[PDB]
From a paper:
The CabRCL form (2.61 Å resolution) possessed two additional extrinsic subunits on the cytoplasmic side, PscB (an electron acceptor protein containing two Fe4S4 clusters corresponding to PscB in the GsbRC) and PscZ (a newly identified subunit whose binding position is analogous to that of PscD in the GsbRC), forming a larger structure with dimensions of ~130 Å × 120 Å × 100 Å. As CabRCL binds electron donor and acceptor proteins, we describe the characteristics of CabRC based primarily on CabRCL. CabRCL contained numerous cofactors, including 16 BChls a, 2 Zn-BChls a′, 10 Chls a, 2 lycopenes, 12 lipids [2 phosphatidyl-ethanolamines (PE), 6 phosphatidyl-N-methylethanolamines (PME) and 4 diacylglycerylhydroxymethyl-N,N,N-trimethylalanines (DGTA)], 3 Fe4S4 clusters (FX, FA, and FB), 2 heme groups (Heme1 and Heme2), 2 Ca2+ ions, 6 water molecules and 32 unknown molecules, in addition to the 12 protein subunits and two UPPs. PscZ, consisting of 60 amino acids (M1–L60) and forming a two-helix structure, resided at the cytoplasmic side and connected to PscB through hydrophobic interactions, hydrogen bonds, and salt bridges. Further analysis revealed that the PscB/CabRC binds to the surface of its RC core mainly through the weak electrostatic interactions between the negatively charged patch on the PscB side and the positively charged patch on the CabRC core side, as well as one weak hydrogen bond between D91/PscB and K701/[name]-2, which is consistent with the fact that the PscB and PscZ subunits in the CabRC are easily removed during purification.
Among these anoxygenic photosynthetic bacteria, green sulfur bacteria such as Chlorobium tepidum (C. tepidum, phylum Chlorobi), heliobacteria such as Heliomicrobium modesticaldum (H. modesticaldum, phylum Firmicutes), some Chloroflexi such as Candidatus Chlorohelix allophototropha (phylum Chloroflexi)8 and Acidobacteria such as [name] ([name], phylum Acidobacteria)9 have homodimeric type I RCs. Here, we solve the structures of the RC from [name] (CabRC) by single-particle cryo-electron microscopy (cryo-EM) at resolutions of 2.61 Å for a larger form (termed CabRCL) and 2.22 Å for a smaller form (termed CabRCS). In both structures, two distinctive c-type cytochromes (Cyts c) are tightly bound, making the anticipated type I RC structures with cytochromes bound be solved.
Numbering used by the authors:
A (entry chain a): 8 to 865
B (entry chain c): 16 to 160
C (entry chain C): 18 to 49, 58 to 218
D (entry chain g): 8 to 45
E (entry chain e), F (entry chain f), G (entry chain F), H (entry chain E): 1 to 35
The structure:
């Protein structure tokens, strides 16, 4: 509490309102100037990059960015404009410009104009509260720009100034004698929600009359398109409601018109809720400590975190298959010279994971900040006499250990289940022998087709149920190995691994057929013989989301489901009967019998072709029905996978793993039960320890629990990233086209570890992304310097280094070096910067898994 | 603040035709594929009778220049429609197995470098942006199965 | 981990092959068992199973350093290339299992995103042998050292790439359980390579 | 020191270890009890 | 819409389920101090 | 469905072996420092 | 001969800029934290 | 033999080199304490 600690804590709560208000208004104005520049960065003369690409789908949907507009403009407004001083537009003049460049420049300028003015008006409230300020204090870096000192004594934002430099003439909100103004923060909740309702109404008027998207049901009967004037329902997506990439009319609320009708809906709701609160503001005793801005800061901030998580979820679904993003896949997208696989989905993934990441940070930081309010209360005596039940509901220390311990138990059980299943199935997929057990892989041999006429040597047991049976090789009467055709494989049969070409399982010798004539519930339309070893395909159904999704889809699609089932049925019967006819040919034994047989097969054949084409086309019609929750790349149903089931369990376990430190902040900011047995009392929110006593105590403060939340949460977050970008999370080494994935029509990019090496071969083909990869790795491992129990070693070595450098200064007569003292971070600041370095390392590196492309092929 | 925009540079495109942005054309599928079809066919003849006079003559000037550098058109090895020639081993772009087992990024370098014996290198004939357009046109030849 | 490895398969002899020549195959300097109880069975058995061109090859012998190793100049003589299935199998499975499985799978059906899948008939029909050499030699895609399909012109010899080319045509129309066997290579070679 | 109860877990872990190795190495070697063969 | 509603309902359901467990423990261990 | 009854037996033995072993190293690490 | 000299000059500048920058980070760390 | 002797001597000269350096620093900063 003397070093660097007073720099990132210089602006703490509570604060006066004019100071919060003006500072927010200035940030708003600054964020509008930055978006201004992003509009300039989106014009059509620039390369694709990750900024202008995250904005383009939305700019298309608004009609600002026209995808099919090539005509160059040469005059538009004021007379004669080939190019000027910076030219016809400042510096945009050497370029050829279209209408969408002008729209983009118009919107960019507005943003910059309205931003700059919001910055000024915000400084009028901010500096105006203080009586006013000087150009030299506002800007502060003008003292050392000699000359300009006569215009750095001028006072701005003053109370009685001439109009153009006034600030707040009555000094503060509370003194100004306007009765409309509300005097507390509860009271003010009402005009705030009226103001927000009005911002909605503004966006809908702009949508309707400036962007020309009327609200449903007042949509136009026709729209203008690059091919002329077209009925709304046939005009393609940016212009009308017809989705080209799914080839269907869009629901009316799936369009930007749907969005302008919701503008008016939401606006009316917010205005009415504000009118209600104008007569009935919040009042209960449970809430009146929230007038302190330090306390509401906790409520608001972790609320916004939850809002951010909810944006991620809603946005993901709503837009995973929307024509805004798919339209990027036809725009010849080139980044750092390259050509991207599926840039639509990539950009979509980046926006949703960016919201996800904001959600975690703000929830955690809101809780941390709440822990600071509560520690304050304890350390001044008034925690024990808080009156709101939102504090007092959790004061009993024994309830606090019951809450925490059962959320550890729930975390434990569900993480053990998830991770334990991942481990079981990587054992299965890798065919590992443990001596005590042999893991066995999925393997499939087609049994219909022409592949069902391929022969195999088969070792057949007689009676698996008599231990001490044994088996024999299937043979001819002549003694030589009979080749069994795949159609005649039976359950129990063993085939040599090396007759199948398998070199990856050298520890066991045979594949066992465990199921014949198998057709995947969801998968390829074929019939198979299977070794299910240890691979647990049933685990897909251990997912409550498998069942809700499939039940609702069955209900919407019941009678094509039913006909597809009857087609499969008729086909399996035809296959079986055709296999018996083929077998009578094989074993016919005398050409009279062999002609009779071949003539029977020749007569059944047309009918077996009919049943196959029937099954094929019902199974194709079934696989093109609309998705509910689990989706294709073309918004079609897919069954849930082992991957989806693992992701369900990992969300429960891993978010509880990551959030148990936050419950420790909320309950144990002053005393945990380990502290309370010793009589200890944590004296501040950020101390590093108090140890070596009792074995050592590093990491009990609230600041540290915040850092341990951030780390532990890296684990569910990376589950989310792998799952968005198409990794397979249910094992560690899944290969892209392994027999299981191929037979069950699953597309994935890798499998835990394998994903990592699989995506990085794509990452290596971009030299900007490989530079990012190198820098990312270096930031991270340096966090270890700062996080290991080693600060004393670093202090005592730094000291040797300082002595030495001062010896060199004194010897060589170099005055700048005879008093060097190297600065060595203390333990608290080492933990802060260690968490910073750990976090940023990891998440630059994750950006790369998204930036490489979306390789899921659906 | 940081990305004040983002300084990514200006986009490389093809040749300019007066009054119609070439940079823009290079991201608008119907414009880029019209130029890909011209390169692919070696003529402006299969272009929509709706094509403007200026367009039809800019393409011809493009071809005439390429004819002096001994450029060989893609059609007629591969045909006007795909799926080349088994005789010459010329690739069939209509085939779905050929299409699934190629990425568009990968396809690029096989046109740049040429491919084994007969398919010629185009690195000294065409710009990398004109190869990108052709990879996009070849994509639209795919048939099912 | 150690000692309790299994019994060795009697069909994999350890009987020794002749040593790799010191002289470069591209040299312009001077160009390019007994009767003891079981020594003849062991030599005959080594002649089918133990590979001769598996080892990385002298640096002057790599295809980028070989005067006749460029895609434009290599000789793809079909009679020499599809002459002997034992040999294609002996050599190409050792080279493939080592170098190519990582990215193309243990079944050779594709592991790394967008990777080839050699069992696909449509892919087989539309590739030449010379085409397959070009993509091994050059790599595929833009990047340093080839793209996502890496280049091999330092790394492999022209003779090693040719065993790879012939082996890869044994993948045609197989199912997704490991690699082509000796009789896959033989049915491929009988149906004209 | 070891409790009776912790000695009776260490017994269940060994019964699961030789029910696994007995069914893994017996059919490999004795060519019987074919149900568990691989 | 159906997918968005299902996903949100499942997140709030995980919270509600945790509340119910954590309150089946509190209600039935009320005679025992945790320690 | 005998593969799903067989598979499940294995998976269940895996969980007893592993979680039994984990809480076996936690009980033997308490005897080496306190009991 | 001349390429080599040109390359030595770029490498020197890089060492002057990266080591130079690193020490400035230390000095700045020093001024914040204390003196 | 030649490569073995060279390597060995290069490691032994790595230690001998360092000592000499250290000896130069000690002698030429005699009478400056390093406090
Ligand atoms: C060919 C691959 C290539 C090479 C060059 C490479 C090598 C190495 C080395 C080395 C010497 O070999 C190191 C030391 C190293 C280090 C790292 N790399 Zn690294 N690395 C590569 C590539 C990359 C890339 C692109 C990325 C990393 C990422 C990272 C990161 C990871 C930091 C970290 O702690 O991350 C924790 C999260 C992990 C490991 C991901 C787990 C994902 C999984 C799907 C989650 C769910 C499943 C589990 C069983 C879950 C538990 C259950 C529950 C609690 C949720 C650091 C800098 C990083 C990352 O994983 O971040 C989460 C990252 O994004 N790396 N990495
Ligand atoms: C919606 C209610 C608000 C909230 C409103 C208030 C108000 C008002 C008060 C507090 C107060 C407290 N809150 Mg709070 N607080 C919220 C969330 C949290 C969370 C959390 C993990 O999310 C924690 C750990 C805390 C903890 C705390 C303490 C710092 C403090 C008093 C102890 C305690 O109450 O234990 C809390 C323990 C928990 C176990 C609760 C966790 C569950 C929360 C309620 C909801 C999560 C679900 C969310 C809706 C899911 C989102 C939906 C999806 C996005 C689709 N709050 C949410 C955002 N909180 C009091 C205070 O004094 O601080 C200044 C106080 O008066
Ligand atoms: C070796 C260092 C390195 C270099 C040379 C580049 C260079 C580039 N970056 Mg990368 N970048 C790096 C490291 C690097 N970056 C690291 C560590 C991160 C994580 C913070 C990033 C994150 C990143 C993003 C998200 C983006 C880029 C982009 C760019 C490009 C335009 C940059 C620019 O406008 O600068 C001028 C701007 C500043 C100096 C700051 C403002 C350019 C190709 C953009 C691009 O699209 O390229 C494809 C882009 O969107 N950069
Ligand atoms: C990049 C990795 C890195 C570097 C360069 C260092 C550097 C050092 N460590 Mg730290 N350390 C690291 C990581 C690193 N460490 C990790 C991962 C851990 C966890 C185990 C630690 C734990 C740790 C402990 C406990 C201690 C140290 C100590 C030391 C110092 C040894 C004294 C000395 O040998 O002088 C020789 C100097 C060098 C050999 C390094 C030269 C500078 C390097 C090469 C490059 C600068 C690179 C940097 C990333 C550049 C960014 C610059 C910016 C402009 C881009 C030295 C300053 C000791 C010490 O005395 O404390 C001061 C010490 O006690 N290290
Ligand atoms: C998942 C675990 C796993 C499995 C199933 C195996 C399997 C095996 N290991 Mg590997 N090993 C592993 C992990 C594993 N190892 C780990 C973590 C290490 C690092 C210490 C090693 C280090 C290793 C070496 C150095 C060796 C092997 C060897 C072996 C083989 C003989 C095993 C043996 O003799 O056992 C009986 C073992 C015991 C009864 C324990 C003693 C066998 C294939 C040998 C082999 O040659 O492989 C081809 C061998 O030389 N192991
Ligand atoms: C390092 C360690 C900490 C981790 C190592 C984990 C690796 C082992 C984990 C699994 C162990 C399973 C125990 C063996 C077991 O019971 O499974 C086999 C079981 O069959 C029991 C019989 C026992 N008869 C009756 C023969 C004596 C046997 O295995 O021999 O059913 C199966 O075989 C399941 C078959 C799978 C699909 C059908
Ligand atoms: C490339 N192919 C992957 C995507 O394929 P597709 O779109 O077909 O299928 C899914 C499935 O649906 C879900 O996956 C819904 C969540 C279920 C909750 C399951 C139950 C959740 C309960 C957890 C409660 C935790 C509490 C108690 C701490 O695609 C998605 O929706 C995933 C994208 C969304 C991104 C994740 C959003 C954040 C995760 C939840 C945040 C939680 C926080 C508020 C803490
Ligand atoms: C009284 N002593 C103890 C109590 O006080 P106490 O510990 O807070 O004092 C610290 C400690 O010392 C360090 O913490 C070491 C830094 C030097 C290592 C030097 C090594 C740094 C290199 C690391 C880079 C690796 C990354 C890139 C992977 O307080 C701080 O340094 C606080 C951190 C603030 C630093 C701000 C950096 C911004 C400067 C950027 C612009 C400078 C130049 C560009 C002009
Ligand atoms: C695995 C490990 C544990 C085992 C270590 C192996 C040890 C092997 C010992 C290495 C033996 C080398 C001799 C062979 C050789 O040097 O070859 C001929 C060499 O003739 C000699 O000088 C002969 C004199 C050799 C008398 C030296 C005895 C060595 C002592 C070992 C001490 C080990 C310690 C204590 C660490 O030729 P030239 O250099 O002239 O020509 C270049 C060759 N192109
Ligand atoms: C080891 C030497 C080999 C052999 C013989 C082959 N490969 Fe690969 N491969 C990879 C990827 C991503 C592709 C797709 C490329 C693209 O379209 O984008 C391929 C493709 C091939 C082909 C087909 C070439 C063709 O033009 O059609 C062939 C014949 C080929 N491969 C053979 C990926 C990788 C690897 C990942 C890093 C590695 C290693 C290999 N390949 C190795 C080999
Ligand atoms: C014959 C003289 C050709 C002309 C002119 C063009 N191509 Fe070609 N191409 C030709 C053959 C014989 C082959 C087979 C290559 C081989 O494998 O041996 C091909 C191949 C292609 C492919 C597929 C490449 C791949 O990687 O798989 C493409 C995409 C292709 N060719 C495109 C192409 C284009 C765009 C051309 C004109 C610009 C073109 N080819 C000319 C024969 C000939
Ligand atoms: S090593 Fe650090 S954290 Fe641990 S007791 Fe000592 S000072 Fe505290
Ligand atoms: Ca990706």
């Amino acid at each position: 509490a003397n070093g660097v600690k007073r720099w990132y804590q210089k602006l703490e709560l509570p604060m006066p309102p004019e100071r919060i208000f003006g500072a927010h208004m200035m940030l708003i104005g600054g964020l509008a100037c930055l978006i201004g520049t992003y509009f300039f960065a989106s014009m059509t003369m620039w390369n694709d990059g990750y900024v202008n690409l995250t904005l383009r789908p939305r700019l298309i949907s608004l009609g600002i960015y026209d995808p099919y507009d090539t005509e160059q403009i040469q005059r538009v407004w004021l007379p004669l404009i080939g190019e000027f001083s910076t030219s016809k537009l400042p510096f945009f003049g050497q370029y050829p410009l279209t209408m969408t460049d002008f729209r983009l420049f118009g919107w960019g300028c507005f943003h910059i104009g309205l931003g700059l003015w919001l910055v000024y008006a915000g400084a009028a409230h901010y500096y105006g509260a203080r009586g006013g300020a000087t150009i030299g204090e506002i800007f502060w870096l003008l003292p050392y720009v000699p000359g300009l000192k006569g215009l750095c004594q001028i006072k701005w934002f003053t109370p009685e100034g001439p109009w153009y430099k006034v600030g707040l003439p009555w000094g503060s909100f509370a003194n100004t004698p306007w009765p409309i103004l509300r005097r507390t923060y509860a009271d003010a909740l009402s005009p705030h929600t009226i103001y927000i309702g009005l911002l909605f109404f503004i966006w809908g008027f702009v949508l309707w009359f400036v962007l020309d998207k009327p609200p449903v049901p007042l949509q136009p009967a026709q729209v203008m398109t690059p091919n002329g004037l077209m009925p709304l329902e046939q005009a393609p997506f940016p212009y009308g409601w017809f989705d080209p990439y799914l080839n269907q009319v869009m629901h009316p609320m799936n369009t930007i018109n749907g969005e302008t009708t919701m503008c008016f809906v939401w606006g009316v709701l917010f205005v009415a809720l504000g009118a209600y609160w104008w007569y009935r503001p919040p009042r209960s005793i449970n809430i009146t400590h929230l007038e302190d801005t330090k306390a509401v800061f906790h409520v608001h901030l972790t609320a916004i975190g939850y809002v951010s998580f909810a944006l991620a979820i809603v946005g993901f679904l709503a837009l995973r298959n929307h024509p805004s993003y798919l339209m990027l896949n036809d725009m010849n997208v080139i980044i750092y010279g390259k050509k991207i696989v599926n840039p639509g989905r990539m950009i979509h993934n980046m926006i949703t994971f960016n919201h996800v990441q904001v959600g975690l940070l703000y929830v955690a930081a809101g809780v941390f900040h709440g822990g600071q309010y509560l520690h304050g209360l304890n350390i001044s005596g008034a925690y024990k006499q808080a009156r709101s039940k939102f504090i007092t509901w959790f004061q009993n220390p024994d309830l606090q250990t019951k809450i925490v311990g059962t959320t550890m138990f729930v975390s434990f059980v569900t993480v053990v289940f998830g991770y334990g299943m991942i481990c079981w199935n990587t054992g299965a997929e890798l065919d590992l022998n443990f001596g005590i057990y042999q893991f066995r892989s999925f393997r499939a041999i087609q049994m219909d087709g022409e592949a069902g006429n391929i022969g195999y040597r088969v070792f057949r047991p007689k009676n698996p149920w008599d231990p001490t049976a044994g088996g024999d090789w299937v043979k001819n009467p002549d003694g030589t190995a009979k080749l069994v055709k795949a159609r005649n494989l039976q359950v129990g049969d063993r085939i040599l691994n090396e007759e199948l070409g398998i070199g990856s399982s050298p520890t066991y010798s045979f594949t066992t057929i465990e199921e014949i004539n198998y057709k995947p519930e969801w998968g390829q339309p074929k019939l198979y013989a299977v070794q299910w070893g240890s691979w647990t395909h049933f685990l897909r159904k251990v997912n409550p989301l498998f069942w809700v999704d499939k039940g609702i889809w069955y209900l919407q699609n019941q009678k094509t489901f039913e006909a597809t089932r009857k087609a499969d049925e008729a086909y399996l019967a035809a296959h079986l009967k055709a296999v018996s006819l083929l077998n009578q040919i094989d074993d016919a034994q005398t050409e009279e019998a062999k002609q009779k047989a071949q003539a029977e097969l020749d007569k059944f054949r047309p009918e077996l072709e009919k049943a196959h084409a029937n099954m094929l086309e019902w199974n194709e019609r079934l696989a093109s029905t609309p998705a509910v929750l689990y989706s294709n790349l073309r918004d079609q149903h897919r069954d849930g996978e082992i991957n989806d089931a693992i992701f369900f369990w990992l969300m429960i376990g891993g978010w509880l793993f990551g959030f148990i430190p936050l419950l420790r902040i909320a309950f144990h900011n002053y005393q945990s039960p380990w502290y309370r047995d010793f009589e200890w009392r944590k004296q501040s929110p950020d101390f590093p320890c108090i140890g070596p006593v009792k074995g050592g105590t590093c990491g009990v403060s609230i600041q540290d629990q915040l850092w341990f939340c951030i780390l532990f949460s890296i684990k569910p977050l990376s589950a989310i990233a792998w799952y968005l970008d198409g990794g397979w999370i249910a094992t560690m080494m899944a290969r892209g086209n392994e027999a299981y994935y191929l037979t069950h029509n699953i597309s994935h990019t890798g499998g835990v570890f394998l994903y990592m090496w699989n995506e990085t071969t794509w990452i290596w083909t971009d030299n900007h992304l490989t530079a990012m990869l190198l820098l990312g790795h270096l930031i991270w491992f340096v966090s270890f310097a700062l996080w290991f129990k080693d600060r004393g070693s670093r202090a005592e070595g730094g000291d040797i280094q300082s002595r030495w450098v001062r010896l060199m200064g004194k010897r060589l007569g170099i005055k700048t070096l005879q008093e060097v003292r190297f600065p060595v971070s203390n333990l608290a600041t080492a933990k802060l910067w260690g968490t910073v370095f750990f976090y940023t390392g990891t998440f630059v590196l994750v950006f790369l898994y998204f930036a490489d492309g979306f390789f899921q092929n659906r | 603040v940081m990305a004040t925009g983002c300084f990514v540079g200006a986009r490389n495109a093809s040749e300019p035709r007066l009054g119609s942005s070439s940079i823009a054309a290079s991201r608008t599928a119907p414009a880029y594929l019209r130029e890909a079809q011209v390169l692919y066919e070696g003529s402006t003849d299969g272009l929509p009778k709706d094509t403007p006079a200026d367009e039809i003559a800019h393409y011809k000037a493009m071809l005439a220049e390429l004819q002096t550098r001994n450029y060989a058109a893609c059609a007629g090895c591969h045909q006007v429609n795909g799926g080349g020639n088994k005789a010459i081993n010329a690739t069939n772009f209509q085939d779905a197995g050929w299409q699934a087992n190629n990425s568009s990024p990968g396809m690029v370098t096989s046109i740049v470098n040429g491919k084994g014996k007969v398919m010629p290198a185009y690195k000294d004939k065409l710009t990398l942006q004109q190869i990108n357009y052709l990879v996009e046109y070849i994509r639209r030849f795919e048939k099912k199965r | 981990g150690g000692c309790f490895v299994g019994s060795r398969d009697p069909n994999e002899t350890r009987y020794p092959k002749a040593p790799m020549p010191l002289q470069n195959q591209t040299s312009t300097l001077k160009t390019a068992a007994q009767n003891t109880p079981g020594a003849r069975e062991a030599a005959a058995l080594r002649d089918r199973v133990t590979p001769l061109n598996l080892q990385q090859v002298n640096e002057q012998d790599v295809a980028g350093n070989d005067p006749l190793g460029s895609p434009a100049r290599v000789v793809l003589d079909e009679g020499e290339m599809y002459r002997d299935p034992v040999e294609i199998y002996r050599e190409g499975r050792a080279l493939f299992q080592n170098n190519c499985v990582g990215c193309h799978g243990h079944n050779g059906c594709g592991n790394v995103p967008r990777s080839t899948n050699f069992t696909d008939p449509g892919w087989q029909e539309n590739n030449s042998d010379g085409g397959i050499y070009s993509s091994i030699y050059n790599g595929k895609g833009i990047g340093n050292g080839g793209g996502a399909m890496p280049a091999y012109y330092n790394q492999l010899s022209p003779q090693q790439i040719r065993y790879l080319v012939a082996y890869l045509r044994a993948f045609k129309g197989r199912q997704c359980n490991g690699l082509p066997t000796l009789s896959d290579v033989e049915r491929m070679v009988a149906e004209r390579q | 020191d070891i409790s009776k109860v912790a000695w009776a877990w260490f017994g269940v872990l060994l019964a699961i270890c030789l029910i696994g190795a007995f069914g893994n190495y017996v059919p490999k070697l004795f060519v019987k009890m074919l149900m568990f063969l691989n | 819409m159906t997918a968005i509603l299902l996903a949100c309902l499942f997140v709030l359901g995980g919270y509600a389920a945790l509340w119910g467990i954590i309150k089946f423990v509190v209600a039935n261990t009320k005679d025992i101090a945790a320690n | 469905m005998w593969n799903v009854v067989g598979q499940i037996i294995s998976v269940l033995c895996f969980f007893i072996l592993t979680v039994g072993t984990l809480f076996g190293i936690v009980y033997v690490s308490h005897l080496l420092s306190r009991g």
